[PDB]
C-alpha cells in the first residue's frame, strides 16, 4: 500500500507531503531526508528500498515525485499510481517549479486523497479526479430547490 | 504578533479571502508555529461558511490543530466542531460527506467520534457509492482506534458487503472487514470463492492479500488457495498476474509452481512497456533462479526474447540471467540467437546499438569460455 506521497527536492526536503496510512508526516519527512543517497546511485531508476519501506519515484523536472510504500506493496500498481500522481501535478501546476507546486499545494493534496484512501487506490482517470474535485452534486442542487419550494 | 493579523483576516474576510487566510494559517502551522488563539476565530468565521473549497481547508486545519489542553483533556471548542462535522456528515453534497468520512479515518479522540457515530453508521446505506466507499473505511477505522465506540463493526461491514454492488465499495468493504475480523472476512471469501477468477482487479488484489494471511493461520485451506492462485496466473490485468506470481512462490517451493511463476514474470518483462517494470520483474526471475538452481533453465529462450527491448539496461539484465543458465544442452541454441541479434545490430539502428553490439560480442565470447 501507499503510505504516503511527497514532492521533494533532490536533497531530501519535502515541498509537500501527504500521509495516507499508518505513518506520521514527521516520519515521512525523516524518510525523505535519507532518500537521496539511495536514489542518486544507479541502483534502480524508479525504486529503492530503505528502512522497512520502498520509495517509488520519478523526476519531476528538478524535483522528485515520491510514493512511500510497505515492502510487500504491488510494485506494478504503485508505478502506475506514481505516473497518475505525476500527471495530476503537471496538469494542475502551470510550471513544475517548487514555488508553483507550493502555490497549488492544498489542491494537490485534495487530489491525492481522491486517488488513495488508507493506502488503497482507485482506478480513476484524470477526468474523474477533476470531476470529483469539482464537487457538483445533483442531490444538493435539487434539495435547495425543494427547500425554496416549501 | 502575526496571529492578530490572521485573526483580523477571519473577522473581516469573505469566502474568497478566507481561503487565502486559511492557506497561510495551514502553511504557518505545518512549518512549525501553531497559532493557538485562532481556533475560536476559525469556528466563528470559517466553519459556518458555505464555500466547499474553504471547507476542505477547514478539515485540513482540523487534522493538525491540537485537540488537548494542558491537562490532557479535550478542548471545549470541539463540542462546537462536532456539530459542524455531524452536519457535514449529513450534507446533500455526496462529496462533502465523502471528504468528511475520509477525515474521520484520521480522528483519534473518542470524545470527538462518539457524537458522530450515528451519522457515520447511516452513511453505510447512502445511495451514492462515493459516500459508501468512504463510510466503510471510516467504520473500520473507528473500530481499529476506538473499539468500544462500535463493537458491532465487523457485523456492519459484513452486512454492507453482502448487498454491495459498486466494485470500489466491494474492494473497500473486504479490505475493511479483514482488517478488523479475520474470521468474518474468511466466511465472506468462502461464499465468493468460485467467482474470484472473474472478480474485478482491485478486489482480486485484496482477495489474494487475504489468502496469504489465511494460508498461515489455517494451513488446511492452502491447497484450495494454491489451485486458485494458479488460475490467477491467467488474470487479465498485469497487476493481478504479478500479484499471483509473487504469492505462488511465497506459498510453495514446488518447481512446477516456481517455473510457472517465473514464466509469468518473463511474460511481463516482454509484455510491459515500462523498462523499469521490465527490470523489476527480471530481478524476480533472477532471484527465483538463484534459490532454485536448474528449475528455470527451460525458460532461457523466453528470457532472451526480452532482448527485443531497445533499452540497454533491460538488455544487459536479460543477458546476465541467460548466461547464468547457459548449459551444454542449450549453449549452441543460445549462441545462434546472440549472433542473430548481433547481425541485426548491423542492419537496424547501427548507431544506437553500438553498446548492445559490444555486449553481444562479449556474451558470445563468454559462452565460448564456459565450454
Author numbering:
A (entry chain B): 2 to 151
B (entry chain A): 20 to 390
Can I see the authors' text?
Crystal structures were available for the majority of the components of the COPI coat, but not for the βδ-COP subcomplex. As a first step towards a complete structural model, we expressed and crystallized a complex containing β-COP19-391 and δ-COP1-175 from C. thermophilum (Ct), from which we obtained a molecular model of βδ-COP comprising residues 20–390 of β-COP (‘trunk region’) and residues 2–150 of δ-COP. The overall architecture of βδ-COP is similar to that of the homologous γζ-COP. β-COP(20-390) is a curved HEAT-repeat type α-solenoid consisting of 20 consecutive α-helices. The right-handed super-helical arch of β-COP wraps around the δ-subunit. The structural model of δ-COP comprises a longin domain followed by a β-turn (117-122), and two helices a (127-135) and b (139-150), which are part of the linker region connecting the longin domain and the μ-Homology Domain (MHD). The stretch of residues between helix a and amphipathic helix b traverses the β-COP α-solenoid in the vicinity of helix 7. Helix b, including isoleucine residues 143, 146 and 147, projects away from the α-solenoid where it would be accessible for binding partners. Helix a and the first part of helix b are present in our x-ray structure. While no electron density was visible for residues 151–175 of δ-COP in the x-ray structure, our cryoEM map of the COPI coat has clear density corresponding to a longer helix, and we modeled residues 139–165 of the predicted helix b into our density. The sequence identity between the βδ-COP from Chaetomium thermophilum used for crystallography and Mus musculus used for subtomogram averaging is 53%.
